[PDB]
C-alpha cells in the first residue's frame, strides 16, 4: 500500500495496462533515486505472507565463536589458515566481525576495520596481522555483488506488485504465484529483522564502492553478505523462472545449513552437486513414451554438419541403463546431515516417466536452485594449496629407453617397450610436416605470430628487468611516458633492438599472479609469461596447432551434444582433473621436446627462425661416437626452452588482502595463460585417447564384447574434446543401445589407463552429455541458471570499481543472459523495466552546483529492451528477438507507424506538411518533447570514456613507437609493401573515407592500449558529465541518416510459415507452450543446426582472418569502397596497407569488384550486425527463402532495383527479417511493398551517407 501510494501509475504502466510514457518514467526515476534502507524495510514488513513461505531457522547462525583459533603463522611468516575438516577446508570462516571494528564518523551505527589494528599489523604483530587478514578477506567476500543489494529487491517489489498478468496469445492469466508466497523474501526479511533488533538502523551492511560498512550488532557473522545474495537470487529467480515452492524451499534450507556450518563457501563447494545428481544424473530410469530429435551425421567427419530428420517416438527399450546412483548420493546427503533433501529429491524424481515439457522444466527448476555465490579465498591459500599438487606415474619410462644427451635433450629409443613411443611418433611427424610447409616461413605469418602474444593483458616483467640488469645489459626505461611499466607492449619495446644471446638468460625469470573467481569452483589463477619466454615457445604452439587442424582434429557447441544425447546414442563424459599440474618433464614435456627437436631437423637445417640464430651443441647420441653437430633455429629454441621446462616455475606472489605475505616458491605446474595451453591440452588428450583405443585397450582385455567395442571406436569418428575435457560419442547399433556392462568395463579400464602415466580421469556415465559446461539430456538443451547469477560480479583486486555508466552497461548483459536462458517473459521483461528504470539517475556531486542525470526510456529501447505498449497499442506486443540499434528501432516503429500517427492527433500535433512516413502529424513537437531524439542520440553516446594523455614528450614517445614498430616488423618487405599501399591509397582511393585500416595504426593502437587502463580520476569524468548535459539540453530535428533512409520502405506480412520442427518435441528447457513467444518463435524458425563458428569464418574475406586489427573493418572498408565507385587500385592499396605481395592483393581486388557477396556479409556497408539473440535460432533459411522481394501483387515500380548496385536487395533482406522477428507470434512470410523513392533514390541516399561514415 505504502509503495502503491508513490508507484500508482508506474506499476500499472509496465504491466501493460496503460502505455509507457516519458512522464511516469521520469517521476518514477525521481522516486527510484529517493530512498533510504528504512524506506525499503518498511516494504518487506508491509507485505503479509501466506505461511507456505514459513519454515524454521536454526539459532546457530547468529552465535558464532571467535576467529583466533582458525589462523596461524608458517615458519616463513606466511599467514595461512588452520584446516579442521580436510585440506579443502581453506576458505573464509563465518564468525565474529563485531569486535575488530571502529565506527564511522557520521554513520554512528555503521563501522569499519580498525585503523589501530592496521597500524599494528604494518608493524608486524602476530594477532594484528591475523585480524587484518580476516577483516580484509571478509570485506572481499562481502564485496562480490554488482549493485547495492536492496536496489534489486526494490525493483523486484516495484515490478512484481502488479499481480498476475494476461498472456495475449494463450488468452489467460498466468498462475505464477504472488509475491506473498515465496520463501526467500520471508527468510531475507526475518534475518534482517533479527540482525537489526533494537537498533533504529535496519540494514545489515552498507556497500560503498571501495569496501563495505558493517553494523555493530553483537550477533553479526560474516556468512550474512553471501547468504543475502543467495536469498535475493532465489527470490528473483522464483518470480521469473516459474519455480515451484518446494525446490526453492529446499535450496533455502541448504543455504541455511550452509550458514550453520563452520565455513560457508566450503559447504557450498562440497554440496555443489546434490541438485544435479538426484535429478539430472538419475532421470526417468523407467519410461514409456515421449519424443526425441532424430539427428543424423553428415559423412565427412571433420566438418561437423548436421541434419534434423524429424522427430521419433520412444519405447521401454530406451530406459536409463546407466548404473545406480542411490548409495553414493545417499551417503553424500548423510555425511553432512542433508538426508531429508536428498530423499525428497529422489522421491519426486522417481515419479516422472514421460519425456515431455514438464519433466524438462522440473530438471531446469532443480538445476536453478544451487547457490550462486563466488567462492573466494586469500591468494596465499590458492598458491599454497593448488600448486603443491604433482602427478604420480606408476609406470614411468624406463631408464634404458633414453639415449645420451644432445645438448640437454635425450632421445627416446626406437626399441622402447613403453607407451610413450606413440606420442613420440605423433609429435615427430607433426613437427616434420609443420616445418615442411612454406606457410611457416611467410614473414606475414611470423609477424602475426609476434602480434599474437603481445596483448594488452600482459604483465610480470617485474623481475625480468631486474634480472636483465643483473646480467649487465642496458635497457631504456623511457622516462616520461603515461604507460605503465607492467604492460607487455612496453616490455617488447624494451626488448626490440637486442640480440637473442643477451636475452637468452631472460627465460629463467619468474611471473606474478592473476586471480579470477568462478561460480562454485576454486578460484582460477591465470598467469602471464614474459616476452622471450613466449617467443621461444613457438614450435610448441605450431606443432600443436598442426595436430588440432590437420592430423587428429577433434575440434578447434550445442548441436554436438544434442546428437550425442539422443537416446540410442549414449555418451561418456571424460574430464581430466588437475590437467595443468599433471603434465611435467617426467613423461610428457620430455618426450614432447625430444620429438619436436628431432622432427624439425630436416626441412629447416641451417636457416634461422625470427630473431633466434643458429648454434651448435655437442651430442652423444650413439654410444661409440662423440661430436659437435650444427643446430638450426627452431632446434635452438627447443634447447633454450628445455632448461626452463626442466627447472620448473617460480611465482612471485603479492596479495593485498593480507599484509606481510610475500613469497616465491618453485612449482612444476604448466602455466595457464601461455601462448600454447589449450591447443596443447587438446593435442595431448586426442593423442592419448587414440593410442589408448588402438594399443592399450586390446592388450589388456579378454572379453570379445569389450574388444569388439574398442575396435570400432576411434578419435576421428567418435571423440570430441576441448581444452582438457571432452565427451565420447557411442553410436547406436542395429539392435538398439549398446550393452552397458561392457561400456562400464571399458570405463573402469580407462581409469586404470590414467593412473599409469599421471592423469586422473573424472568420468561420469549417466545417460547425459556435458560439454563446455552445457548439460543436455535426450537431445534437449538445459540452461544452468545457477551458472549465471544476477546479483554477483567477479572482483579479484581490492581496487575501487568503475564509475556510473558501466554499472548500467552490465544490465543489458543481465537481460541478454536472461534471453539466452528460459524465463517467463511476462514478469522477467517487466523486472528488466523496473531495474533499468531504477538504475537511471545518479546525483553527481560537483562543487556548489546541483546537477542531475537521467537516460530516457528510448535509450534503453535503443539498446535492446522492447516495449510493452506504444501510444495506444495492444498490450504485450513486441518480442525481444528484436535487433539492437537502428534496425530494431526501425522495425518496431514500422509495425505501429499508422496507429502511432493516429495517436499523434490524440492530443493533436497537427501540421500542413505531409511527409511520406507521417503525413498529418509533425514529429518534432512530439518527439523532442518526449526526449525520443535526445534519448536516441544519448544512447549513441559512448559509455566509459577516459583519456589521460599525460603530456608525452615527442622524442621519447617517437622512440617508443619506433621501437614497437621495429619489434612488430622486423622484415623490411612488410615496410615496403605498406608504404607502397599507403602511397597508392592516398593517390587513388583517399578522399571518400579518409580513414584507412593500416598496419601502422597498430604501433599507435598499442601505445594507447597501454593507457586504456590508466583510470585517471576527475577531469574526464566531469567532461563526460558536460557532454551528457549538452547532449541533453539540445533539441534535434530528425533521426540519423540511416533511420530516415530506412523509413521510406514498406512491407507486408501474411501466410504464416510452416513449422520447422515438431511442436510436441522438448528441444530446450524453459521454452514450452507456457512460454508463448520464445517457444513459438523457435518452432517457427527452427534451431541453428550449424556449427556457426565456421559460418562466420567463411564470411570474412581475409586469407586467414589474422591481422592483429579488426578484420571486420578491413572487410567493411573493401565493401564500402566497392559499392561507391573507387577504381580497383584503391582496393589493391587498401589490402597492401594490411600487407600482401602486391599480386594477391590485386587479384583479390579484381575479384571483390565483381563477385556476389553473401547476404550476412553485406551488413558491413551499413554497419548492421546479427544480434546474439538470434544465435540459437536459424536465420540462414529465413534470409534465403522467407524474406523475398517482388511481392505477390506483382510489380509496383517502387520494387525495382537496377542490375548495378544490387546490394540493396541484401540489406532489404535484413530489413524484412528484422520486421519478421520483432513481431510476437510465429515468423511470417513478408513481401516487399512500396519504397516511395525508388531504388534510384535509395541508392543515392545510401551513397550520400556513405560519403561520410
Amino acid at each position: 500500500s505504502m509503495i502503491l501510494t508513490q508507484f500508482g501509475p508506474f506499476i500499472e504502466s509496465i504491466s501493460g495496462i496503460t502505455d509507457q510514457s516519458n512522464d511516469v518514467f521520469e517521476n518514477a526515476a525521481k522516486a527510484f533515486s529517493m530512498f533510504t534502507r528504512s524506506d525499503v524495510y518498511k516494504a518487506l514488513d508491509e507485505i503479509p505472507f501466506s505461511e507456505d513461505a514459513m519454515l524454521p531457522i536454526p539459532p546457530t547462525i547468529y552465535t558464532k565463536p571467535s576467529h583466533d583459533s582458525y589462523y596461524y603463522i608458517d615458519a616463513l611468516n606466511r599467514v595461512r589458515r588452520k584446516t579442521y575438516q580436510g585440506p579443502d577446508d581453506v576458505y573464509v570462516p563465518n564468525c565474529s566481525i563485531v569486535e575488530l571494528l571502529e565506527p564511522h564518523e557520521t554513520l554512528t551505527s555503521y563501522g569499519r576495520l580498525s585503523e589501530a589494528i592496521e597500524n599494528r599489523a604494518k608493524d608486524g604483530d602476530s594477532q594484528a596481522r591475523i585480524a587484518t587478514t580476516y577483516g580484509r578477506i571478509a570485506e572481499s567476500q562481502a564485496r562480490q555483488i554488482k549493485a547495492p543489494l536492496e536496489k534489486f529487491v526494490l525493483a523486484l517489489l516495484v515490478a512484481e506488485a502488479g499481480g498476475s498478468l494476461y498472456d495475449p496469445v494463450l488468452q489467460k492469466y498466468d498462475e505464477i504465484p504472488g509475491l506473498s508466497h515465496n520463501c526467500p523474501l520471508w527468510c531475507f526479511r526475518e534475518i534482517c529483522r533479527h540482525i537489526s533488533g533494537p537498533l533504529p538502523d535496519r540494514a545489515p551492511y552498507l556497500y560503498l564502492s571501495a569496501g563495505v560498512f558493517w553494523l555493530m550488532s553483537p550477533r553479526m557473522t560474516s556468512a550474512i553478505p553471501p547468504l543475502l545474495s543467495d536469498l535475493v537470487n532465489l527470490a528473483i529467480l522464483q518470480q521469473t523462472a516459474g519455480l515451484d515452492p518446494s525446490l526453492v524451499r529446499l535450496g533455502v534450507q541448504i543455504c541455511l545449513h550452509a550458514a550453520a556450518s563452520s565455513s560457508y563457501a566450503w559447504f557450498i563447494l562440497k554440496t555443489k552437486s546434490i541438485f544435479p545428481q538426484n535429478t539430472l544424473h538419475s532421470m526417468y530410469e523407467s519410461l514409456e513414451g515421449g519424443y526425441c530429435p532424430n539427428l543424423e551425421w553428415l559423412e565427412p567427419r571433420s566438418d561437423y554438419k548436421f541434419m534434423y530428420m524429424g522427430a521419433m517416438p520412444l519405447s521401454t527399450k530406451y530406459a536409463r541403463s546407466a548404473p545406480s546412483n542411490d548409495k553414493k548420493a545417499r551417503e553424500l546427503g548423510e555425511k553432512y546431515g542433508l538426508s531429508s533433501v536428498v530423499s525428497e529429491l529422489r522421491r519426486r524424481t522417481k515419479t516422472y516417466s514421460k519425456h515431455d515439457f514438464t519433466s524438462v522444466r522440473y530438471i531446469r527448476d532443480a538445476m536453478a536452485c544451487t547457490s550462486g555465490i563466488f567462492l573466494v579465498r586469500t591468494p596465499t591459500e590458492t598458491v599454497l594449496q593448488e600448486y603443491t599438487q604433482s602427478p604420480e606415474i606408476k609406470v614411468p619410462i624406463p631408464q634404458k629407453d633414453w639415449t645420451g644427451p644432445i645438448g640437454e635433450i635425450r632421445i627416446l629409443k626406437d626399441t622402447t617397450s613403453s607407451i610413450a613411443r606413440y606420442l613420440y611418433r605423433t609429435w615427430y611427424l607433426a613437427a616434420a610436416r609443420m616445418a615442411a610447409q612454406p606457410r611457416t616461413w611467410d614473414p606475414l605469418f611470423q609477424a602475426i605470430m609476434r602480434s599474437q602474444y603481445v596483448t594488452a593483458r600482459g604483465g610480470s616483467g617485474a623481475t625480468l628487468r631486474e634480472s636483465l640488469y643483473a646480467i649487465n645489459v642496458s635497457l631504456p626505461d623511457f622516462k616520461g611516458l603515461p604507460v605503465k611499466a607492467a604492460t607487455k607492449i612496453f616490455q617488447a619495446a624494451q626488448l626490440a633492438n637486442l640480440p637473442f644471446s643477451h636475452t637468452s638468460v631472460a627465460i629463467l625469470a619468474d611471473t606474478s599472479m592473476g586471480l579470477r573467481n568462478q561460480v562454485q569452483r576454486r578460484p582460477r589463477s591465470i598467469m602471464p609469461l614474459n616476452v622471450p619466454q613466449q617467443q621461444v615457445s613457438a614450435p610448441h604452439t605450431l606443432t600443436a596447432d598442426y595436430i588440432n587442424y590437420h592430423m587428429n582434429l577433434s575440434t578447434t557447441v550445442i548441436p554436438l551434444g544434442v546428437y550425442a544425447s539422443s537416446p540410442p546414442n549414449q555418451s561418456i563424459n571424460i574430464d581430466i582433473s588437475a590437467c595443468d599440474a599433471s603434465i611435467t618433464w617426467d613423461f610428457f614435456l620430455s618426450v614432447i621436446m625430444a620429438a619436436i627437436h628431432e622432427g624439425v631437423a630436416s626441412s629447416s637445417i641451417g636457416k634461422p627462425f625470427m630473431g633466434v640464430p643458429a648454434s651448435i651443441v655437442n651430442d652423444e647420441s650413439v654410444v661409440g661416437v662423440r661430436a659437435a653437430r650444427p643446430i638450426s633455429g627452431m632446434q635452438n629454441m627447443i634447447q633454450h626452452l628445455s632448461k626452463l621446462y626442466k627447472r620448473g616455475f617460480s611465482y612471485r606472489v603479492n596479495d593485498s588482502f593480507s599484509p606481510g605475505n610475500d613469497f616465491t616458491h618453485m612449482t612444476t605446474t604448466f602455466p595457464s595463460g601461455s601462448t600454447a595451453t589449450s591447443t596443447e591440452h587438446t593435442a595431448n588428450n586426442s593423442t592419448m585417447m587414440e593410442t589408448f583405443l588402438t594399443v592399450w585397450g586390446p592388450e589388456h582385455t579378454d572379453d570379445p564384447d569389450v574388444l569388439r567395442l574398442m575396435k570400432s571406436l576411434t578419435i576421428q569418428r567418435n571423440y570430441v574434446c576441448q581444452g582438457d575435457d571432452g565427451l565420447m560419442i557411442i553410436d547406436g547399433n542395429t539392435a538398439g543401445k549398446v550393452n552397458s556392462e561392457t561400456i562400464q568395463k571399458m570405463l573402469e579400464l580407462i581409469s586404470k589407463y590414467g593412473e599409469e602415466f599421471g592423469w586422473k580421469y573424472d568420468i561420469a556415465y549417466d545417460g547425459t552429455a556435458e560439454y563446455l559446461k552445457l548439460y543436455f539430456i535426450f537431445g534437449c538443451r538445459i540452461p544452468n541458471l545457477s551458472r549465471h547469477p544476477i546479483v554477483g560480479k567477479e572482483r579479484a583486486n581490492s581496487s575501487a570499481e568503475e564509475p556510473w555508466p558501466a554499472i548500467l552497461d552490465q544490465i543489458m548483459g543481465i537481460f541478454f543472459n536472461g534471453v539466452h536462458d528460459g524465463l517467463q517473459w511476462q514478469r522477467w521483461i517487466r523486472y528488466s523495466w523496473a531495474l533499468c528504470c531504477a538504475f537511471s539517475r545518479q546525483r553527481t556531486m560537483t562543487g556548489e552546483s546541483v546537477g542531475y542525470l537521467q537516460y530516457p526510456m528510448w535509450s534503453f529501447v535503443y539498446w535492446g529492451l522492447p516495449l510493452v505498449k506504444v501510444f495506444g497499442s495492444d498490450p504485450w506486443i513486441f518480442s525481444w528477438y528484436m535487433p539492437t540499434g537502428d534496425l530494431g528501432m526501425y522495425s518496431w516503429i514500422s509495425l505501429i507507424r499508422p496507429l502511432m500517427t493516429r495517436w499523434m492527433v490524440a492530443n493533436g500535433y497537427v501540421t500542413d506538411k505531409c511527409s511520406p512516413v507521417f503525413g498529418n502529424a509533425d514529429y518534432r513537437k512530439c518527439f523532442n518533447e518526449l526526449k525520443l531524439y535526445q534519448g536516441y542520440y544519448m544512447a549513441q553516446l559512448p559509455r566509459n570514456p577516459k583519456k589521460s594523455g599525460r603530456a608525452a614528450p615527442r622524442e621519447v614517445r617517437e622512440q617508443f613507437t619506433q621501437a614497437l614498430s621495429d619489434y612488430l616488423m622486423q622484415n623490411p618487405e612488410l615496410k615496403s609493401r605498406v608504404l607502397r599501399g599507403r602511397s597508392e591509397w592516398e593517390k587513388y582511393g583517399a578522399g571518400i573515407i579518409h580513414n584507412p585500416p593500416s598496419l601502422f595504426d597498430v604501433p599507435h593502437k598499442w601505445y594507447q592500449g597501454a593507457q586504456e587502463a590508466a583510470t585517471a580520476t576527475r577531469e574526464e569524468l566531469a567532461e563526460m558529465d558536460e557532454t551528457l548535459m549538452r547532449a541533453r539540453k539540445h533539441s534535434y530535428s530528425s533521426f540519423s541518416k540511416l533511420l530516415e533512409a530506412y523509413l521510406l520502405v514498406k512491407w507486408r506480412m501474411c501466410e504464416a510459415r510452416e513449422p520447422s520442427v515438431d511442436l510436441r518435441l522438448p528441444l530446450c528447457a524453459g521454452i514450452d507452450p507456457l512460454n508463448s513467444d520464445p517457444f513459438l518463435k523457435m518452432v517457427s524458425v527452427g534451431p541453428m543446426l550449424q556449427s556457426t563458428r565456421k559460418y562466420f569464418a567463411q564470411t570474412l574475406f581475409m586469407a586467414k582472418t589474422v591481422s592483429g586489427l579488426d578484420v571486420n573493418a578491413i572487410d567493411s572498408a573493401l565493401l564500402r569502397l566497392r559499392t561507391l565507385g573507387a577504381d580497383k587500385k584503391a582496393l589493391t592499396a587498401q589490402l597492401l596497407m594490411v600487407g600482401l605481395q602486391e599480386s594477391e592483393a590485386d587479384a583479390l581486388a579484381g575479384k571483390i569488384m565483381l563477385q556476389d557477396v553473401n547476404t550476412v556479409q553485406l551488413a558491413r556497408v551499413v554497419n548492421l550486425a546479427v544480434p546474439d539473440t538470434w544465435m540459437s535460432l536459424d536465420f540462414d533459411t529465413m534470409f534465403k527463402h522467407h524474406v523475398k522481394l517482388l511481392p505477390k501483387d506483382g510489380r509496383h515500380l517502387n520494387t525495382d532495383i537496377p542490375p548495378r548496385m544490387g546490394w540493396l536487395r541484401a540489406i532489404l533482406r535484413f530489413l524484412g527479417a528484422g520486421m519478421a522477428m520483432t513481431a510476437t507470434g510465429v515468423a511470417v512470410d513478408i513481401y516487399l511493398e512500396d519504397i516511395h523513392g525508388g531504388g534510384r533514390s535509395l541508392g543515392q541516399r545510401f551513397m550520400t551517407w556513405m560519403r561520410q561514415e
Binding site: 507507424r897 499508422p898 505531409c914 503525413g919 498529418n920
Partner: peptide, 18 residues
C-alpha cells in the same frame, strides 16, 4: 474521422479523405 493508407494521414470528413 478517417485516415489515408499511404502516409497514414488522418482526416475527418470522407470527401476530404477522397
Amino acid at each position: 474521422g478517417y485516415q489515408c493508407h499511404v502516409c497514414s494521414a488522418v482526416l475527418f470528413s470522407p470527401l476530404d479523405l477522397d
